Design a protein around this ligand. Structure first.
Ligand SMILES: C[N+](C)(C)CCOC(=O)CCC(=O)OCC[N+](C)(C)C
Ligand SMILES: C[N+](C)(C)CCOC(=O)CCC(=O)OCC[N+](C)(C)C
Ligand SMILES: C[N+](C)(C)CCOC(=O)CCC(=O)OCC[N+](C)(C)C
Ligand SMILES: C[N+](C)(C)CCOC(=O)CCC(=O)OCC[N+](C)(C)C
Lengths: 533, 536
């Protein structure tokens, strides 16, 4: 019995496991329950805290993945499979994971809490790209990750109902945050220095905690990678949530109480079987069950809340990858595949814009087509294929990030912004997709430090830089290394100067204006258009 | 005669003429100035098509420029060369339908390609007698035969009650056409070749050239065309019949007149100055780069809108040279956008930019206007008053000249034309407008006409070499339909503009440089998106 691996939390005693990182050992405490299993009558309900347990609880292995859709597009292909469940699926899934240095930190240590993405319909904290041992070992971080409910189980809402009030997967996250406040000191973490970080739906999630008061007392700084609470996909109105839940109910054969009662009788997979039959249009970058503007967790729309918020004592790191849109084109737009170069026709480009901007009127779609067409090379298939990716990336991620970045800065936040431009040498998706959505994550987590993964030396040194920016941000709210004059400074993003940095193999470069002209189109003109069209 | 210069006596259909020997820097040229080509359009003949000149007896003195057609005189900046150079330099009269011919001295031996100039000035102003339209240098240096005509402007040229007998519209264009017919019948007497006639014009003059391309009866009267900083398509060059009627009727009210016969009869009693004095009160909006009396779509001279005619025309037989100056819009800002002056740097606020967009795009709805502001804003520096000033200039230049030209060039090339395109980017060293205006609308003309060859005008040496190059491109185009020198083969070539490659050339003090796409992205906004906005 190794006493570094024995921890007493409020609910009782835990035994972790010593893991091998390249540089030395780390302590891992995996599969720690933070809620009563949300099963049976508890399906669609807010989480309750985990009852205390007897003896020593085994925290040496990852727990089950929350019940979710499993991708079939390309069976056996790493590029897709690396996001799929790597443990058994279960509704009993509300567990979290802590990595700390071994031996446990001598003094209170800043805590990073990771919130995974997956369109709010998928994901797990157990995926290889979310492995906390490298940050723990190399930077001395205390790293936490939690499972939260996805799909119908986390986000099916009959707004105003007692029994499916909405947003319960966000409440799972909040409960894990409260758990860290109450317990993390036992592991050597500092509950007074907690930084949330997440990517895509997880970044959206972090943003929603920024915009929901009860969560604000549970963390100090935030990182939003390739996602925002504002924007076209991260939330639905109460009326639309109700529509989709009643449609799903109808499709599985089901007074809210009577309707939800019958949904609870249904096997998990029966619900997943009809998850993708409830969206209003043929779309990509659109998810059926997502956070709802309930007037409770979210008191108003994210837009309203970011415009009117006071963000004075907040620090935020935000950014995007170079090719946010490409990944999504192969899941919906005719002409696109990982197995060819996806050179497309102009006709195919117009059709793809209707699918990528599903809420666009005929005229708005035309405006999108006209803005993104290169009028020097209007029928060039390479240009049209890349234009399609940009439409999707800009509309869904880049322009929402620019918007958020600017509102936070204007309203007193300390903001830092990046664009991530390195394509991993070991990437299995084709070259045309460039640096796709999700593919900075393996670098921030420091996976290239594992020599068995076959990254280059240059990538390892890069990963080390990124780990430093992130953990320095966690420590001080400023990604800049205070043990460095030599390396170029990362300036705060401001609405005036609009400075952001490029994260790539070359040293930091400072740039101005995150797609400024194109995002004025999406952020300023299109709204005016359709609030008139 | 007996003691007169025998090389200055020429006969035309209407009778004998006596011209004058003028000095060009390189040597003498022959000028026949003030040749009547129509009966004076005065009295009962105001607003009516021109009738051809009845023959005169004896020798008509053709040694001085004749009257300028009755028109508005600019007094925005009295005594200032930049404005006065465009103002009338002879007496204003409704008796003004005269033309001018410059030829080599002695007159050429064999039939010589002819250039016909059509002036601009908003269809409300201009004269063939202005110094910048002096044909002596082209005639002497290139051996050209050059012809310029006065044509009626403003109400006199363009006021219309469409469908009427007494004011059918487009009579100023018919003035131009009669001058073209005159050239066909008479130019051989001067040594010109009526089988090689190239029209060229700037601004409203270029729009006029384009309307002759689009009007069948005009097309037998020339072979090739140059359109400088203007087009028949676009927001200003024409009005609909209903809009012409409304403007004509309002003007009649304003001067104390209101059945068409009766209304026109009463207009014909008004002093010409009374019409000019009320001419600017009939525009539908507060505006710049809009003119009250312009060509009307009458279903006669213009059988359909120019937009429709360029979309469906067959232009296989056509060779055209078209282009724009670097800063088409700047000139117009000082005539009505608050914040703008020739006497300061005209740095404006963002509020002043939105107000200026409404004046510069007066037909635009609120949504259209914000589309324009959003497109033209620099979102890295959305309140920089230097960018905002230059954006205002670009808005007006792009909307009225650059994108209409881009579109004209595109359609003509698609429909069979041989098109050559330029941007003119040299600012005259002697320009009296402020530096912020750049290369303003109309400031290429003095170079094409070769004024820098006159050393008394104080242009630089480089400017003189430059003018000689331009004169060569223009006259080579007149001669052959191709601006390229057939026996210079070392100097960089000017390729035709095509829809595929969208090639055009920079005209400046450096050797020709080929560029691609004439404001391709921005012109897609004006030419494709804004229209679609309108349709709902
Ligand atoms: C099918 N399954 C869901 C049960 C396991 C999927 O396996 C992986 O992709 C794990 C390896 C992985 O994460 O791939 C990316 C590794 N990388 C980025 C270091 C190359
Ligand atoms: C976490 N990650 C975002 C980095 C990987 C997500 O990958 C996707 O499948 C994105 C494409 C997508 O959302 O497709 C939905 C497929 N559908 C409709 C079958 C569920
Ligand atoms: C007063 N007026 C209306 C009777 C005549 C105005 O005179 C001029 O501006 C003639 C000078 C001129 O055309 O100068 C501009 C061209 N440049 C630079 C070659 C002299
Ligand atoms: C070179 N050019 C003769 C072709 C144009 C220069 O003349 C102008 O006045 C341009 C500005 C303008 O058109 O103002 C008209 C408005 N008005 C009549 C009220 C002065």
């Amino acid at each position: 019995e190794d006493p570094q691996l024995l921890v007493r939390v409020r609910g009782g005693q835990l035994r972790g496991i010593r893991l091998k990182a390249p540089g030395g050992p780390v302590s891992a405490f995996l599969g720690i329950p933070f809620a009563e299993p949300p099963v049976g009558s508890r399906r669609f309900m807010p989480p309750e805290p985990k009852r205390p347990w007897s003896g020593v609880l085994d925290a040496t292995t990852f727990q089950n993945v929350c019940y979710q859709y499993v991708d079939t597009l390309y069976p056996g292909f790493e590029g897709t499979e690396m996001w799929n469940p790597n443990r058994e699926l279960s509704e009993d899934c509300l567990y979290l994971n802590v990595w700390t240095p071994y031996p446990r930190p001598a003094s209170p240590t800043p805590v990073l809490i990771w919130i995974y993405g997956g369109g709010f319909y998928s994901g797990a904290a157990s995926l290889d790209v979310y492995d906390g041992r490298f940050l723990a070992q190399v930077e001395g971080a205390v790293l936490v990750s939690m499972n939260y409910r996805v799909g119908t189980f986390g986000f099916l809402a009959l707004p105003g109902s007692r029994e499916a009030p909405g947003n319960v997967g966000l409440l799972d996250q909040r409960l894990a945050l409260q758990w860290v406040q109450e317990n993390i000191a036992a592991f050597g973490g500092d509950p007074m220095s907690v930084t949330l970080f997440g990517e895509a739906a997880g970044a959206a999630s972090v943003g929603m905690h920024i915009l929901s008061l009860p969560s604000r007392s549970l963390f100090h700084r935030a990182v939003l990678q390739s996602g925002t609470p504002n924007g076209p996909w991260a939330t639905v109105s109460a009326g639309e949530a109700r529509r989709r839940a009643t449609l799903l109910a109808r499709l599985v054969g089901c007074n809210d109480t009577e309707l939800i009662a019958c949904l609870r009788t249904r096997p998990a997979q029966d619900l997943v079987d009809h998850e993708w039959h409830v969206l209003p249009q043929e779309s990509i970058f659109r998810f059926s069950f997502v956070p709802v503007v309930d007037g409770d967790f979210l008191s108003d729309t994210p837009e309203a809340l970011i415009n009117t918020g006071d963000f004075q004592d907040l620090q935020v790191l935000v950014g995007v990858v170079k090719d946010e849109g490409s990944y999504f084109l192969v899941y919906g737009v005719p002409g696109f595949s990982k197995d060819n170069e996806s050179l497309i026709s102009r006709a195919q480009f117009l059709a793809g814009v209707r699918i990528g901007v599903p809420q666009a009127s005929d005229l708005a779609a035309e405006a999108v087509v006209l803005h993104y067409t290169d009028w020097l090379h209007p029928e060039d298939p390479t240009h049209l294929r890349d234009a399609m990716s940009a439409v999707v990336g800009d509309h869904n991620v880049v322009c929402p990030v620019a918007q958020l970045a600017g509102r936070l800065a204007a309203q007193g936040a300390r903001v830092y912004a990046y664009i991530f431009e390195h394509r991993a040498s070991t990437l299995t998706w084709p070259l045309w997709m460039g640096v796709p959505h999700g593919y900075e994550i393996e670098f921030i987590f420091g996976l290239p430090l594992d020599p068995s993964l076959n990254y280059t030396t240059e990538e390892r040194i890069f990963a080390q830089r990124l780990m430093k920016y992130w953990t320095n941000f966690a420590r001080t709210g400023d990604p800049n290394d205070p043990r460095d004059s030599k390396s170029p400074q990362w300036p705060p993003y401001t609405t005036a100067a609009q400075q952001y940095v490029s994260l790539n193999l070359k040293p930091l470069e400072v740039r101005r204006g995150l797609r400024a002209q194109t995002c004025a189109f999406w952020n300023r003109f299109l709204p005016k258009l359709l609030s008139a069209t």
